[PDB]
Write a protein that binds this ligand. Structure first.
Ligand SMILES: OC[C@H]1O[C@H](O[C@@H]2[C@@H](O)[C@@H](O)O[C@H](CO)[C@H]2O)[C@H](O)[C@@H](O)[C@@H]1O
Ligand SMILES: OC[C@H]1O[C@H](O[C@@H]2[C@@H](O)[C@@H](O)O[C@H](CO)[C@H]2O)[C@H](O)[C@@H](O)[C@@H]1O
Lengths: 729, 303, 304
């Protein structure tokens, strides 16, 4: 209560030096209960100053002056100046007004979105402040909706300046941390809106195995249940809780077959038409909810109702879980209306996520975003994106920006959901992004033409998709370790560049560029290739330091902004000198944790990586060319070491140290080989190819090689050749 | 009209002529004050060049060497000497690349691709340097012409081009620092040798005269109106022209008909970025492709 | 007035601020004690150093506890305060709503440097007479952003010289100075000629100023004030009367390079009209496209 101040009809709680709760109450009673958004207001004491007069109060922290002149909250009575100079005159917050600078957050869904859509604000601002209004209902101690807050205005003023990571950590302290995901969530998911049989689904899973594509999750979309078989008097077949017996004559046996293949199983649930009289569970639900069965009274969807929720979980979901369903895909698109005023999507995510923990430890849902704090109910499901280059070009930005409201587990339909147009290169670029996204779930529309199976495409596209799908499983150790860091430390897997580089203007000018964990920087290509180059491109900002392409070892001297070119089969992913990345050596092998880790080391600096696991922690240190691996607990795990180009240690057990000062630091990547390959694939004149190869071979001085390419009439070819010269400088 | 006069001044003969039109007079004061002043400056330069031209004329007559040579006379085995049709040697000390295309209005500058042979080259007017061998697009305002001299070049100029006198009473010896050089000034009744050897400049003549010699070494007049044969040591004197990247960058950005935000960003970034390779990488991102080439010319000269 | 300012110790004493907590004297023009400390202890010492009048440059919104726009409070009170030390003194500030003509001069602010901005500005200026706000001062040549074009700068100065106020101003760019010698010799000489013409016109302007003050007649009138029943008086947005003896049709479009001349469609009312500079005659009534070199402006005077 030292950090609590009352003045007129207002209450101010100084939670941190940079976070102030602001309340109004007509009744002089203020709200202590949790809300849909806020789970915890216990924060360590902080120092601040007050100037309290007859008519006014000023609260002063290290970063903000908050002023209240009494009366009802207006833009004139309640306002704040930040103690920063990030702008010339955008340093003042006025109650109920917008200011410039917000770096945005996320939105409910990408349903029906072709390219960009507007986002809600987040808690991050280039000008150093943000206000997060709490407009939600209060909860009970066990987490049911209690009704309206007695704080009829309840706001959180964030004044973290450009300390974005601390703003997000303290947001997680206020709204609750993200829970740990289970390891299975981080592998490849298969999904398709397609009327598979038990037989054709298992045949497809076995084809994945034959094709060397690993999967963690088998999604079964809505054709699992009755659709066309629903009498039209009941409405549509969109909602269903009854297996189609022609396609799934023995559901538990089919789910047992997926479980024997080490797949987790989820079903699509369209909840909005509730439980109607044709459904297999209807007789039990009708008994529980005292429905008029002779008038075929439906159990209408009503998540405000405790008895409805219990019948839904116990008598509708329950029998399907007993057949082996592992977790629920909540696919809600029917609006925000309820008698309580609570969004039905929030009620579903909150209650289903809680219910999911009963049968499985660290279980998930798959559902759309339900507003600030809904990160407590992973995973995010963005929905029915339009299949286009424009949609892909929006999606990396969308994903990293979501970290600004703490929603760090978006699962996008990889390759896009529906409508749009066919382009196998779009499908391949989208999968590249997906593999370097929070979740890699392949999914598609009801079209006969939109399957994301790699072997849908030509041999080049197929092989590249298989390679990227294998890479996702190689990355599960790195992903699972980052997941435990999200849960315990409040750090997002995917960060916008400005989290690490808040004072670099270029960190705000590369919307689709992001940090992926702590060791990798990703610049997805999201534009159709230039046919004259047979390469796509993206402008990359390289921070200070020496950077390596993660795949090729091509080097780049930061700090620089440089257009980079890749063939459709290659993705721009970069690691600094000293980076250490663990990889599963056996990504196809079905085993709860890897029996073998590859330690991939980028030479040129010291580094360190901590591999967090279910039942271990393993530290890899690279210090003055000595690489050491230690673990809390011992195991039979075999460690492989790759130092730049070369495997140094194969399948060594236990803790150890090896000196790498003696070993070759340099990657094989060389200017001449890369130049020949770019000229060779280009759809340009052979005379141009001959002249460029000859002149760049003959001209010795780097500055004169650049002058030569500066004369080229092909402006994009100049930029491609300039990237090679910059790396070879 | 102005570009054509620039070429004419660096051609065998500079004869202004026109049609029967009331509208085609080549009088400088036909044009606006900027065009007029530039035409007057080039017309004065033609008379400053008469000593150099007359000496080359006597070399045509006695030695069979053309005043104007295609690049391939001096550089027969260089492919680039066959790829710059409008580029030529003008006497033995100067290389000319006339601009013969209408200016790019976004830059307020015309341009020409110049082949620089091996060696260090200087713009004859500005001292802007270029390291050969390179092919480089060069940009000039409509009032300026690409004319180049190698390190060690010695060019005589009439100090008094308006003065009516059968032979100049005063010669300016314009010396380009950085190498040895030599020039023989053939005249009606004399030969005068200017030698630049290990930083010692010597002037000797067959016959004596009252002619007064002026010496300009790079930027600076060293000797004013000295009579007779003499020698002066220039090892002690400033070799460098004033030409500098920063001044030239500001002028190009200032005249350009582009966005002020672009001007501000380019000036700021090229001032802040220290490493030459990263300055080039910055200009490589510019959406204006010709502006890239203009900024690249300045970075190449400032490397 | 924040705690680092030279006048802060005096303002802190007057307004009983907590100096050890560095309490700022926040802007509050609703507050009599704040206004008096602002005029007497903040402006006052700067006026004593010789400041003649105040450029009030307010861009931070319309919010106050009173509901009165802070810009109105500034213009109303500063204009009144300015009369203490100088007779008929001015301010320079943005428009604060109907009646704010009582506090000249108008300051239009941070226009984008473009042909489009110039093409709007004569219309903007004459139309303002319709709410009695007749002393707009525009940044001549445009304020910020936009693009370089020495002809735009010259056309903008031509308009400025025939506008209520001729104030050259620019952005923080190293590249946007309005100095005539920034430009080439042709542009420089023309800008110098127009700048000299502004001072030649001060007698005419000062006489019109006294007519605004005493008779309620704007210096700049839309054509329809003099010709209310002529449809063509509503079809020449940038054309205006300038005092009672001159009619101005600024050129606000980039020249046609084939002609080396810009142009504007001029409506000539009934009567015999002369170009003010050349004496070129025109028989009204007619609508006629007129062409001028970039150094010449269409300004006309009737016979007599
Ligand atoms: O469960 C089937 C799919 O339903 C939702 O998407 C629908 C889409 O595939 C198509 O049929 O259009 C409608 C109307 O826009 C969508 O509601 C889910 O978004 C999707 O993931 C399912 O596969
Ligand atoms: O006092 C400096 C200038 O401030 C205002 O204009 C600013 C402008 O020059 C630039 O910095 O952008 C900001 C944001 O749009 C403007 O506030 C005045 O309008 C101007 O007259 C001053 O010169």
């Amino acid at each position: 209560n030292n950090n609590i101040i009352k003045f007129d009809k207002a209450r101010f709680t100084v939670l941190t030096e940079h976070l102030i709760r602001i309340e109004y109450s007509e009744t002089g009673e203020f709200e202590e209960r949790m809300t849909q958004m806020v789970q915890n207001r216990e924060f360590s004491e902080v120092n601040f100053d007050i100037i309290e007069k007859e008519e006014t109060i000023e609260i002063i922290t290290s970063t903000v002056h908050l002023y209240y002149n009494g009366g009802e909250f207006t833009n004139a009575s309640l306002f704040a100046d930040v103690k920063f100079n990030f702008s010339v005159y955008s340093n003042r917050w006025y109650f109920g007004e917008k200011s410039d600078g917000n770096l945005k957050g996320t939105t409910r869904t990408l349903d029906m979105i072709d390219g960009e859509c507007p986002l809600e604000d987040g808690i991050m601002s280039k000008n150093g402040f943000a206000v997060l209004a709490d407009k939600g209902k209060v909860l009970t101690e066990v987490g049911d909706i209690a009704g309206n807050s007695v704080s009829t205005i309840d706001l959180y003023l964030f004044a973290y300046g450009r300390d974005y990571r601390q703003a997000l950590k303290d947001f997680y302290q206020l709204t609750g941390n993200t829970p740990k995901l289970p390891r299975f969530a981080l592998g490849n998911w298969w999904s398709r809106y397609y009327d598979y049989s038990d037989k054709s689904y298992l045949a497809l899973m076995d084809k994945f195995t034959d094709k060397k594509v690993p999967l963690s999750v088998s999604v079964i979309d809505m054709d699992w249940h009755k659709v066309s078989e629903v009498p039209s008097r009941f409405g549509s077949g969109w909602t269903g809780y009854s297996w189609n017996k022609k396609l799934f004559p023995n559901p538990e046996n089919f789910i047992d077959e997926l479980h024997q293949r080490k797949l987790k199983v989820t079903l699509n649930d369209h909840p909005a038409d509730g439980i109607r009289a044709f459904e297999d569970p209807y007789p039990q639900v009708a008994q529980t909810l005292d429905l008029n069965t002779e008038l075929e009274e439906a159990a209408k969807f009503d998540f405000d109702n405790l008895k409805f929720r219990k019948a839904y979980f116990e008598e509708v979901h329950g029998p399907l879980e007993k057949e082996g369903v592992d977790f629920w895909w909540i696919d809600w698109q029917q609006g925000a209306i309820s008698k309580s005023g609570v969004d039905p999507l929030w009620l579903l995510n909150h209650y289903q996520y809680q219910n999911a923990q009963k049968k499985h430890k660290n279980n998930i849902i798959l559902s759309r975003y339900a507003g600030p704090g809904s990160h407590r109910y992973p995973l995010g499901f963005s929905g029915a994106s339009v299949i286009s280059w424009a949609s892909l070009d929006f999606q990396p930005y969308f994903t990293s920006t979501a970290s600004n409201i703490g929603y760090t587990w978006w699962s996008h339909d990889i390759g896009g959901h529906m409508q749009g147009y066919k382009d196998a290169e779009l499908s391949l670029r989208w999968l590249q992004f997906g593999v370097f996204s929070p979740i890699n779930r392949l999914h598609s529309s009801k079209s006969e033409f939109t399957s994301k199976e790699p072997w849908h495409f030509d041999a080049v596209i197929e092989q590249s998709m298989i390679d990227f799908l294998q890479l996702r499983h190689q990355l599960i150790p790195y992903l699972y370790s980052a997941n435990l860091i999200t849960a315990s430390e409040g750090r997002a897997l995917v960060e916008p560049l400005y989290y690490e580089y808040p004072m670099e203007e270029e960190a705000y000018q590369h919307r689709n560029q992001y940090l992926f964990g702590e060791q990798l920087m990703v610049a997805p290509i999201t534009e159709k290739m230039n046919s004259l180059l047979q390469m796509g491109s993206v402008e990359v900002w390289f921070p200070e330091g020496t950077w390596y392409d993660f795949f090729s070892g091509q080097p780049y001297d930061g700090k620089v902004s440089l257009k980079v070119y890749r063939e459709i089969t290659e993705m721009p992913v970069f690691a600094k000198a000293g980076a250490i990345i663990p990889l599963d050596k056996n990504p196809l092998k079905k085993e709860e944790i890897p029996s073998e880790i590859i330690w991939k080391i980028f030479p040129g600096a010291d580094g360190e990586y901590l591999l967090l696991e279910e039942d271990n922690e393993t530290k890899a240190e690279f210090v003055n060319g000595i690489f050491t691996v230690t673990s809390k607990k011992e195991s039979s795990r075999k460690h492989t070491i790759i130092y730049g180009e070369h495997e140094i240690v194969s399948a060594k057990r236990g803790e150890f140290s090896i000196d790498l000062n003696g070993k070759e630091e340099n990657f094989d990547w060389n200017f001449s080989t890369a130049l020949f390959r770019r000229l060779d694939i280009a759809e340009i004149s052979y005379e141009q190819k001959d002249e460029i190869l000859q002149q760049l071979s003959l001209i010795e001085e780097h500055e004169k090689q650049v002058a030569f390419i500066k004369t080229n009439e092909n402006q994009e070819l100049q930029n491609s050749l300039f990237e090679l010269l910059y790396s070879g400088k």
